[PDB]
Amino acid sequence: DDPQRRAYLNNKFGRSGNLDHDINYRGNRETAAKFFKSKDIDPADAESYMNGLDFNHPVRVETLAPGKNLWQYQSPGAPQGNWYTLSPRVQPTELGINPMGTNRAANTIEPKVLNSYRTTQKVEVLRSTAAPTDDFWSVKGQSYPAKGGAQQLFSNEKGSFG
Amino acid sequence: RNKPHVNVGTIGHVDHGKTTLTAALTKVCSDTWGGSARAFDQIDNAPEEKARGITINTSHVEYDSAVRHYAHVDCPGHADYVKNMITGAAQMDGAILVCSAADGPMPQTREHILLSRQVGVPYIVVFLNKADMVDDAELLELVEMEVRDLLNTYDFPGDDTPIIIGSALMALEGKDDNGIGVSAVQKLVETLDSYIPEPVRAIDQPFLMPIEDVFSISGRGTVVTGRVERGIIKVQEEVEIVGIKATTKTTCTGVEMFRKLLDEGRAGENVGILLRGTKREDVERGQVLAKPGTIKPHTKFECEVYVLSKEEGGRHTPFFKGYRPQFYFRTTDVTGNCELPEGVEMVMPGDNIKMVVTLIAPIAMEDGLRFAIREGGRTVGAGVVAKIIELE
Ligand SMILES: Nc1nc2c(ncn2[C@@H]2O[C@H](COP(=O)(O)OP(=O)(O)O)[C@@H](O)[C@H]2O)c(=O)[nH]1
Ligand SMILES: [Mg+2]
């Protein structure tokens, strides 16, 4: 088949170069959506969560045995989040989140504190690398761009983790 | 009317409309060419098939065309397709690759094309499903070019491959708005009639019989007993003893079934054939009697293998590069080395991989030949000869 037109279609519809790449892309996105539907809530939020995931790098569903120590950055006096990080040496921007967050009751802006969690049960988690997203949440006025180079974990079972 | 049997099935990604296309096929064929329609829910709720190996949830349906009788296979999940394809449990003379045009190609699509190439599926017809959800024809054109690229990628004639645009759901519900409904599925069946060739009958294939046992009486002669897999052996016909050692040439002086001495031995029959001027030291197990120049022995070959999980009786441990499992070919056990694919050095029980096997003894083999992999005499995996690796 004559090229150029294939290039025309690829450029027109989003496609970028090799087919295998976009195929893996689609597969990872599908895996994310499937996880969000399969585990607890799947409303409007699922899309916003989805924006935070980078699908070029592989995003896989995994089951985690108890006793695994994972940690997460959370604003001072803020409730436990759904996102977690494997290694403490990861920068906050790398996780697709603002280094600092809002602190309620105080209503003041304060650096996010790293908290250490352990698994008390066997829990299902969605492994994924963070996308480079803008972090308008956790800062009322500041919108914060994030590098998003690091891996993430997602589980709405807060009781199982926290 | 006279119509011959042909084996087909639906393959593709999840939720792309495999089962839906199946129900559409049986419905349209029932309404058009006559027959018994089938239910979506019955097929989707695929019953477990026990087989002789791992439990595979497989749905079998049947539908007749104008000139053919079609036996169709559908599976709920990709794992089912892996187990069903790699093992002989389902034979397809033609494959129907259904791909959602609205979503485009997906990992299991390309993986199913790859598996079709490896396991020996000779022909693939592509049905571009969910064409009702797409208003832009340019997208259909693009996805068409994409699936053609995938087919060309895995040695399928994608340029000449018949691609049909339509919607399995719109066809099943009997509306046929535009050209997408029952007309499209009708054209699909017609395409199955015109593109997919007729299966060669096992009795029309060249002669092939795995030697099960060998009886030799010094002065009287040697007779080899076993079950004829392919073709027909006749008295005074020349045959080749292939496998284990050097290929030998012989002549069938007689065919014996129980007490009876027959004019010939046909496929499916358990017989004992007398070999002229042969000795027991010349004939071993695993060797096969074949039509001259139809089969050859090989030691090193690329194959696709599926490892049994711990539940289905498989091992509790992954593989290495120096793994030396037993390989069961037809009627014999043969020790052989195995080479893992690039980037991988560990495979868990339940995975399917492209493995390069190098046997210690040459075995008469062909492309597409299914074989077993055993540990301590018990099956730990199953595979199929993807491609013979020549040494020249
Ligand atoms: N909107 C729409 N949905 C479809 C169409 N074809 C199939 N589907 C949906 O795809 C879903 C999956 O069906 P299917 O892929 O055949 O089941 P599977 O064989 O187990 O993967 C069904 O629930 C259908 O509702 C279509 O043309 N339009
Ligand atoms: Mg199904």
Q: Facing residues of B332 across strands? A: B329
Q: Please, what CATH class does the domain formed by B202-296 belong to? A: mainly beta
For helices B137-153 and A19-38, the axis angle rounded to 10 degrees is: 110
Annotated ligand binding at B293? The verdict is no
**Closest to B323 in 3D by CA, of B358, B371, B361, B298:** B358
Domain range for residue A57? Answer: 5-161
Burial category of B212 from C-beta neighbours within 10 Å (exposed 0-12, middle 13-18, buried 19 and up): middle
Q: Which of A1, A5, A34, A61 is the best residue to mutate to test the B interface, defined by the most B CB atoms within 10 Å of its own CB?
A: A1
The number of folded domains in chain A is 1
Could you tell me the residue ranges of all domains in chain B?
1-199, 202-296, 297-389
Give the N- to C-terminal CA distance of chain B in Å, as an integer: 51
Instruction: Enter the DSSP assignment of B44.
Output: H
Answer for the pair B149, B142: CB distance below 8 angstroms, yes or no: no
The DSSP code sequence of A25-38 is: HHHHHHHHHHHHHH
Please name the residue that has the structure tokens 């011959």: B4
* Residues facing B330 on adjacent strands: none
Token pair of B142 as six digits: 């693009």
**CB-based contact B363:B329 (threshold 8 Å):** yes
Residue B210: C-alpha distances to residues A40, B53, B292, B300, B318 (Å): 56, 22, 15, 20, 32
Phi, psi of A143 (to 5 degrees): -110, 125
User: Rg of chain B over CA atoms, in angstroms?
Assistant: 23
Q: How was this structure determined?
A: X-ray
| B180 membership: H or E segment, kind and range | none
CATH level 3 topology of B297-389:
Elongation Factor Tu (Ef-tu); domain 3 (2.40.30)
* Whole-number Cα distances in Å, B89 to B53, B83, B112, B345: 9, 8, 16, 29
DSSP-derived 3-state class of residue B321:
coil
Tokens describing residue B372: 């077993």
Enumerate the residues of chain B whose CB falls inside 8 A of the CB of residue A23: 105-107, 109-110
Ligand 1 atom 23 nearest Cα: B15
Dihedrals phi, psi of B165, to nearest 5 degrees: -95, 130
Within a 10 A sphere around the Cβ of A36, how many other Cβ atoms? 20
By the 8 A CB rule, do A123 and A82 touch?
no
In A, minimum Cα distance to B152 occurs at: A1
The torsion of the CA quartet B306, B108, B149, B72, rounded to 10 degrees, works out to 80
8 Å CB contact of A12 and B138: yes
Within this chain, domains B1-199 and B202-296 share the same CATH topology: no
- Per-residue burial over B217-246, b if 16 or more Cβ lie within 10 Å, else e, is eeeebbbbebbbbbbbbebebebbbbbbee
Does any CB of chain B come closer than 8 Å to the CB of residue A9?
Answer: yes
B1-199: CATH topology? Rossmann fold (3.40.50)
